Structures are given as C-alpha cells and as structure tokens.
From a paper:
Cathepsin H is a lysosomal cysteine protease of the papain superfamily involved in protein degradation. For preventing premature activation, cysteine proteases are synthesized as inactive proenzymes called zymogens that contain a prodomain and a mature (catalytic) domain, and the removal of the prodomain leads to the activation of the enzymes. Upon activation, cathepsin H displays a distinct proteolytic activity among the papain superfamily, functioning predominantly as an aminopeptidase that cleaves a single N-terminal residue from a polypeptide chain. Unique among papain-like cysteine proteases, the mini-chain (the octapeptide EPQNCSAT from the prodomain) remains bound to cathepsin H through a disulfide bond and is essential for the aminopeptidase activity.
Purified procathepsin H protein was not autoprocessed under the acidic crystallization condition and we were able to determine the crystal structure of procathepsin H at 2.00 Å resolution. Procathepsin H was well defined in the electron density map as a single polypeptide chain comprised of an N-terminal prodomain (Ala1P-Pro93P) and a C-terminal mature domain (Tyr1-Val220) with a disulfide bridge between Cys212 and the mini-chain Cys80P. bLigand/ion in the structure of procathepsin H: N-acetyl-D-glucosamine, β-D-mannopyranose, α-D-mannopyranose, sulfate ion, glycerol. Glycans could be assigned unambiguously in procathepsin H for the two glycosylation sites, Asn79P on the mini-chain of the prodomain and Asn115 on the mature domain. However, these three catalytic residues in procathepsin H are shielded by a group of hydrophobic residues Tyr72P, Leu73P, Trp74P from the prodomain, which effectively blocks the access to the catalytic Cys and prevents external substrates from entering the binding site. Structural comparison with cathepsin H revealed that the mini-chain in procathepsin H runs in the direction opposite to that of the substrates while the mini-chain in cathepsin H follows the substrate binding direction, suggesting that the negatively charged C-terminal carboxyl group in the mini-chain of cathepsin H is positioned to interact with the N-terminal amino group of the substrate whereas the cleaved mini-chain in procathepsin H needs to reorient to be involved in such interaction.
Author numbering: 2 to 313
The structure:
C-alpha cells in the first residue's frame, strides 16, 4: 500500500475528468493506488537511461491484468505456421521507408475500444494501404465486418484473430464493406455483410516465413505496409516516444497477443527500428504510432507477418 502524495492526487483528479470517469469512494481508492504506482514507474523509467520514454495515457489507472482481459487477445492464435509463400529477393534496401510520407497511402489512426479486435484494424489498415498504393483511392474499410463475420477462418471477434486469416476471409467472401455502410461497434455482433456493398477486395495473401524479419524489411520497402503480431507487456502500455524494446517479452508465436501495421522503418543513433501504426487512438504513443527496435525479432514481431495483394 502506497502513500500517495498530493501531486499524484491532484493529477489523478484531472485525469478522471479528462477521461470522463466516475468511481465510488471505495473503487476510487484502488484506482488512485494503481495510478500512483504507474506514475512512479513512469518517472523511474524516464529519469533513467532508455531508448524510449513512458507517459500517462488512457490506461494509467488500470493494472496489466485488467488491461489484458479487456484489451488484448483472450487466447493464443494460430500464429505459428510451418508453411509460407513469400520468398525474399536481394538487398540492399533503402536506409529508411515511410509510406505515410510517400503519399496518401496510410489511413488515419483508429480506436479499437475495449475489444481485442486489433487484428481487424491491422487487416483493414494493410488493405486500405494496398488499394491506395494500387489505385490512388484511400478507403476506410469495416473492421466490424471482420469482428462479426470472419469466424470460418479461425478468427474470434473481440477475443482475437489473425491478419492472414482475415485476408483469406476477405478473399473467399468476395470483399469487405466500408466503415460507412458497416460501422464499428467495439463488440461482437450479428454478421450484416451485403455483397453489393463490398468496396475492398483481396486477390492473394502473402505469408512471410516465421522469424523472417528481413523479408518484412523487403516487403515494406517494395510493396506494402505489413501486418504483424507481437507480445504486448505492461511497459508497452505506457509507451510514449522513442524506440521501444524489452528484455522480458517473449519472441515465440504462442505468446504474441496484439496485431499492428508496420508502415516504414529507419534508424536513430545506430539503433534500427520499425514505424508501426497502432489502434489505440491518435493520442496514444507518437500520434497513434510507435517505434520498435528492428533486427532482433523484438517481442516476436517477425513470428507471423502478412500482407494482401488487392483485387482492383
Ligand atoms: C497463409 O496463411 C493463411 C492463414 O493461415 C492460410 O489460409 C488458408 O488458406 C486456404 C487457401 O489456401 C483456405 O482454404 C480454402 O478455404 C475456402 C473456404 O473454405 C470454407 O468454405 C468451404 C466451402 O466453400 C468449406 O468446405 C470449408 O470447410 C470452409 O468452411 C475453400 O473454398 C477452399 O477450397 C478450394 O480449394 C481447396 C484447396 O485445398 C480445394 O480442396 C477445394 O476443392 C476448393 O477448390 C480452400 O479450402 C483456408 O481456409 C485458410 N485458412 C485459414 C485459417 O484462414 C493460407 O493458406 C496461407 N497461404 C499459403 C500460401 O500457405
Ligand atoms: C487453430 O487451428 C486449428 C486447426 O484448424 C483449429 O482447430 C479446429 O477448430 C475448429 C473450430 O473450433 C474445429 O471444428 C476443428 O475440428 C478443429 N480442428 C482440429 C484439428 O483441432 C483451432 O480452433 C485454431 N485455433 C484458433 C485459436 O483459432
């Protein structure tokens, strides 16, 4: 049990109003304890020497147990595969790539809410980019269709799923609707797919070999943003800026629990990194993005990467 100082208290009061919270007197006390505990972890981290900084955000009054139950996958997915189809060509590759800068090729940052549906945002993000790169038309595709309808490809709505499986669903389903006709609800609903309203389509699915991080480099450089999954741990939730890395996350496919979208890569002070779009809204991290160290299979990010070839 912590002794909470008045600085922490006054900041928790502001945080509650900013995030529109109400607590009973008895839950307020437990929430304040978690907030103060995170406050000190953030300060202790930022006051030391690290390649990334932490900060307060929408998760700051939650324990990681609660975060995991509400926001991350509730079960491991079938990330491990003994077969793939992507075969890498030859380097070297550009020193840095950023599909956000090449043109209008990356959609705005979205918010998955209290639902483990990040695999659906990773999927729509990758396909939105692919269609924009191929046609100059930037769409916004319906994550909720994947949440509600993609179960025949071993996806599980708000419990989790995989981009490669979702790309196959879109391929065999003959398309995905837009956000405009199938709006996002942040919970498991009834499938409302209408064939004549599909606006995005998949021709092929590229699966990158397990641990083949260099093929990810090539695919981002040459073709498309790349969907991938990694293991989120407690420190990552409070990521603010810089190059994320961790010595406690695992690197294996059975431990990944969060899907995202690599939109580029670079290097800073000798440290290679990935530029990654998240789905926790534009005020998380670096305007909704994070950097994560490249070349080390960091947190298992090279375990099951994939991207689509659009039918246009
Ligand atoms: C990259 O990674 C992904 C994800 O793991 C792999 O995805 C699998 O992809 C295969 C295709 O390569 C998918 O299999 C196909 O599914 C279609 C739909 O199946 C449903 O509907 C049929 C009725 O139409 C039901 O019988 C079935 O039980 C499902 O409910 C089928 O229409 C396909 O059948 C056609 O091709 C097969 C080839 O085996 C023939 O046997 C058939 O006669 C028919 O012509 C086919 O079965 C599979 O669903 C995907 N799995 C998942 C979990 O998403 C990719 O394979 C992988 N890519 C590579 C290259 O490895
Ligand atoms: C991982 O893949 C396996 C094999 O495709 C899935 O197991 C199948 O699950 C379906 C639906 O639950 C059953 O109808 C099949 O009989 C199962 N087959 C086998 C061989 O077990 C499994 O559900 C997938 N796991 C996840 C998390 O999606």
């Amino acid at each position: 049990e912590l002794c909470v100082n008045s600085l922490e208290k006054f900041h928790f009061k502001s945080w509650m109003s900013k995030h529109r919270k109400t607590y009973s007197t008895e839950e307020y006390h437990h929430r304040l304890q978690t907030f103060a505990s995170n406050w000190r972890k953030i300060n202790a981290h930022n006051n030391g020497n690290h390649t990334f900084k932490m900060a307060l955000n929408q998760f700051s009054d939650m324990s990681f147990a609660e975060i995991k139950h509400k926001y991350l996958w509730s079960e491991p997915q079938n990330c491990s595969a003994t077969k793939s189809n992507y075969l890498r060509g030859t380097g070297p590759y550009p020193p840095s790539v950023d599909w956000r800068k090449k043109g209008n090729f990356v959609s705005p940052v979205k918010n998955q809410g209290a639902c483990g549906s990040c695999w659906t945002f990773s999927t729509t993000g990758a396909l939105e980019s692919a269609i924009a790169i191929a046609t100059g038309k930037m769409l916004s595709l319906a994550e909720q269709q994947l949440v509600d309808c993609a179960q025949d490809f071993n996806n599980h709505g708000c419990q989790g799923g995989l981009p490669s499986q979702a790309f196959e669903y879109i391929l065999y389903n003959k398309g995905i609707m837009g956000e405009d006709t199938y709006p996002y609800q942040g919970k498991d609903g009834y499938c409302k797919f209408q064939p004549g309203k599909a606006i995005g389509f998949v021709k092929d699915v590229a699966n990158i070999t397990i641990y083949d991080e260099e093929a990810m480099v090539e695919a981002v450089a040459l073709y498309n943003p790349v969907s991938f999954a990694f293991e989120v741990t407690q420190d990552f939730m409070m990521y603010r800026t810089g190059i994320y890395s961790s010595t406690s996350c695992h690197k294996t496919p059975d431990k990944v629990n969060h899907a995202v979208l690599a939109v580029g890569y670079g290097e800073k002070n000798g440290i290679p990194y990935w530029i990654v779009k998240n789905s926790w809204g534009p005020q998380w991290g670096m305007n909704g993005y994070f950097l994560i160290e490249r070349g080390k299979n960091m947190c298992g990010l090279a375990a099951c990467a994939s991207y689509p070839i659009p039918l246009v």
